[PDB]
Design a protein around this ligand. Structure first.
Ligand SMILES: [Cu+]
Length: 66
């Protein structure tokens, strides 16, 4: 992964990673570095307990206010 152009990574509980790039592209790799299609509309939990959903090429994160 070209981490110098990655602005945010989400480290998922299952060891996969979602990477969001400076130009707005997004990709995913499993724990072995194999590319994955991103599951749109699926709740995914991060290692620190955050939950996210990807929809319309955007990341939505559990509202910390609640
Ligand atoms: Cu995505």
């Amino acid at each position: 992964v070209d981490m110098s152009n990655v602005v945010k990574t989400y480290d998922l509980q299952d060891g996969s990673k979602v990477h969001v790039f400076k130009d707005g592209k997004m990709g995913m790799e499993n724990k072995f570095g194999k590319s994955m299609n991103m599951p749109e509309g699926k709740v995914m939990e991060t290692r620190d307990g955050t939950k996210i959903i990807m929809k319309g090429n955007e990341i939505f994160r559990l509202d910390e206010a609640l």
